[PDB]
Amino acid sequence: GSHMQTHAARMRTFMYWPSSVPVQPEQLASAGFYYVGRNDDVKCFCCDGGLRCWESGDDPWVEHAKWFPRCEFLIRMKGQEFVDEIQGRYPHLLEQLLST
Ligand SMILES: C[C@@H]1CN(CC(=O)N2CC(C)(C)c3ncc(Cc4ccc(F)cc4)cc32)[C@@H](CN2CCOC[C@H]2C)C[NH2+]1
Ligand SMILES: [Zn+2]
Predict the structure, then answer these.
(1) Which residues pair with 35 in a beta bridge?
(2) CB of 45 closer than 6 A to ligand 1?
(3) Distance, CA of 30 to CA of 79 (rounded, Å)
(4) Any idea what the CATH number is for the domain that residue 65 is in?
(5) Protein residue with least CA distance to atom 24, ligand 1
(6) In this structure, which residue's CA is closest to atom 21 in ligand 1?
(7) Any known ligand binding at 92?
(8) Using a 6 Å cutoff on CB, does residue 63 contact ligand 1?
(9) Residue 77 domain boundaries
């Protein structure tokens, strides 16, 4: 999309985020997601991928890589190797583990 490109702008959309959803605004906004204003529906500012029905223990970066692996914002922030491993591809696991 053309909006919500900054972390601060994404955070502002969470003003009416329901307090009972077990995933928090900071986690979502960091992973590129902003609140669309209905239920627990979020969208990525970059790939426009939509996610809902957040569950306790969900990791927004893992959900981003599981559903929208070609997102250029996801790749810039987390790197192609992170996305590959979420997609079940491990030819570069040792180097990944070593590098960090
Ligand atoms: C966090 C986790 C996500 N998960 C998948 C999910 O949310 N995806 C996967 C898919 C990309 C196929 C998809 N496409 C449309 C919508 C709808 C939408 C959401 C936001 C929005 F702004 C506008 C529309 C959701 C959605 C949940 C399980 N989902 C729940 C829905 O049915 C599919 C199922 C697999 C569990 N929680
Ligand atoms: Zn995205």
Answers:
(1) 42
(2) no
(3) 15
(4) 1.10.1170.10
(5) 50
(6) 50
(7) no
(8) yes
(9) 1-100
Structural resolution in Å: 1.8
Ligand 1 atom with the smallest distance to the CA of 55 is: 37
Domain count, the chain: 1
- For 33, 34, 60, 75, 92, the CA distances from 50, given in Å and listed in that order, are 9, 10, 12, 17, 29
Experimental method: X-ray
Partnered with residue 44 across adjacent β-strands are 33
CA of 67, closest atom in ligand 1: 11
Alpha carbon 68 to its chain's center: 9
At 20, list the tokens: 């009972």
What tokens appear for 57 in the block?
């223990």
Beta-bridged to residue 34, according to DSSP, are: 43
**Ligand 1 binding pocket includes 57 (Cβ within 6 Å):** no
